[PDB]
Amino acid sequence: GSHSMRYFFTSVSRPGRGEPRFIAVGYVDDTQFVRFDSDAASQRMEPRAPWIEQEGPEYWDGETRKVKAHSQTHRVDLGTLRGYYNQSEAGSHTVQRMYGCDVGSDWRFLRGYHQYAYDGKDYIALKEDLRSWTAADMAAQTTKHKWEAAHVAEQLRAYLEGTCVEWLRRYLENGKETLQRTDAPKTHMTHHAVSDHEATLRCWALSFYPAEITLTWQRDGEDQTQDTELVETRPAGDGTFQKWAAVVVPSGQEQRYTCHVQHEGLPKPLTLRWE
Amino acid sequence: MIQRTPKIQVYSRHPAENGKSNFLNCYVSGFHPSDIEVDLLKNGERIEKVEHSDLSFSKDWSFYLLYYTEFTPTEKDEYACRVNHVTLSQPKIVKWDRDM
Amino acid sequence: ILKEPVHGV
Hints:
The complex is a heterotrimer.
Chain A: E1 3-12, E2 21-28, E3 31-37, E4 46-47, H1 57-85, E5 94-103, E6 109-118, E7 121-126, E8 133-135, H2 138-149, H3 152-174, E9 186-193, E10 198-208, E11 214-219, E12 222-223, E13 229-230, E14 234-235, E15 241-250, E16 257-262, E17 270-273
Antiparallel strand pairs in A: 1-2, 1-5, 2-3, 3-4, 5-6, 6-7, 7-8, 9-10, 10-15, 11-12, 11-16, 13-15, 14-15, 16-17
Chain B: E1 7-12, E2 22-31, E3 37-42, E4 45-46, E5 51-52, E6 56-57, E7 63-71, E8 79-84, E9 92-95
Antiparallel strand pairs in B: 1-2, 2-7, 3-4, 3-8, 5-7, 6-7, 8-9
Chain C: no helix or strand
PDB class: immune system
Keywords: glycoprotein, immune system, phosphoprotein, immune response, secreted, amyloidosis, immunoglobulin domain, host-virus interaction, amyloid, membrane, photocleavable peptide, pyrrolidone carboxylic acid, envelope protein, disease mutation
Assembly: trimeric
């Protein structure tokens, strides 16, 4: 299948409370493998997956050096963005940056991306072509013009099409046991009385990987999407994921309902019926 | 400025079985800004040995965090997650429904 | 692996 590597950077100004908080995390597909936290003791990029722990001193020294460079850039960004929007000095603000790349089944470059946000809102984004920019507003225009002149896009395209996919492939190899696995969901249904004339039917999908999954309820084959409570897919904490969907069924109509499960790890979609 | 309310789920890593070690999870997602207070409670009292994941975010830029602690469920022990955020006029307490 | 060098907005 295809794969992705993505880095997430968050920077939060804390006026009169020291330098801004900076947090960086890296993911291959749905698996985290590194992190940096400016409030942590080490002041180094750190491993968050077993398959990356033995990468070696050169790798860790290099990522630590670069992630500090990122941290410092974002430290200046916060002042700059306050200066573009003429905002008060006492308020806390947030910058967010995400970049990464995807490879196909062949492990060929598929796409690259670079997105930037200020206070929870799109600010500037690299377009699909990796040659131009999309500015969210007027302030973002200043940046757009500045990066267009600094040929920053060319630099990113080089990274995304080169270093990014080269190392994604290396990680996929290194953690081929963790990353190149699919864990099919273990499923079951539960039944709980709501009254004397109603019951909650809950369809569970547990311990699956990757996170992508589809859980749907049907009554006589008709999608009950509007009457389904569906929680967000959530981490179990062990690298696997969980999800459930529930419907309230009039007591006695259980046999009309089926839960349908689709996951990459399954040979064919599952259809669960209470009976 | 943008603000998004945290969604909260409280659950065990493995199916809950009395007398068997497990992890208690409180997953908070979809919030903004990142400042958030999350506590896990055993019988109304804050649990001290609680760790959390590294702050990350979703496609809409909203944040998510997993708070967790090792625990052994017992038939009578009560667990919950207490969450405070700017979008909340008061801290929300979600009880662990050891089902469902 | 991360990018280098990053550019200010």
